Ligand binder design. Sequence first.
Ligand SMILES: CCc1cc2c(n1Cc1ccccc1)CCCC2=O
Length: 127
Amino acid sequence: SMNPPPPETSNPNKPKRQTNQLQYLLRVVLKTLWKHQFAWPFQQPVDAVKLNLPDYYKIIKTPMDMGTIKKRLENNYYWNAQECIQDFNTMFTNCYIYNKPGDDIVLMAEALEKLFLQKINELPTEE
Ligand SMILES: CCc1cc2c(n1Cc1ccccc1)CCCC2=O
C-alpha cells in the first residue's frame, strides 16, 4: 500500500504574510491543541500504511493534520488567518467523515475542536 504525497508546506511563489492573527493562530491556537493529551494522532499526516487504513485516501481527498499546519505557520506559508482556520476545520471534518460517532478518534477530535472554537472566538482584530 501507499501514502499520497503530503500537503504542500513550502511554495516560494505563493505570496505570504506574518500578521497578528496568524501569530495568534501559532502562539495560542496551534500550541494549545498541540500540547493536549489527544493531539498525538493529529500531529502528522494520516499514515494509511502503518494504520492499515487502505481506504483512507479513497475517502479523504483533502488531507490535513496539525503537523502540516505547524509547518505552514512556522514557515509563514499563509496569506491570512482564514486559510489556516480552514486547515484546522478540514482536519476535524476529515475525521468525522472517515470515522463513526463515538469512536475514540472522533472523541479526540471533538475535544480538540472544542478548544479550537474557544480560541478562535477570541481571534484578535487585525493590526
Ligand atoms: C480507524 C483508525 C483511525 C482513524 C484515524 C486515526 N486512526 C487511528 C487511531 C484511532 C484512535 C486513536 C488513535 C489513532 C488517526 C488519524 C486520524 C483518523 O481519522
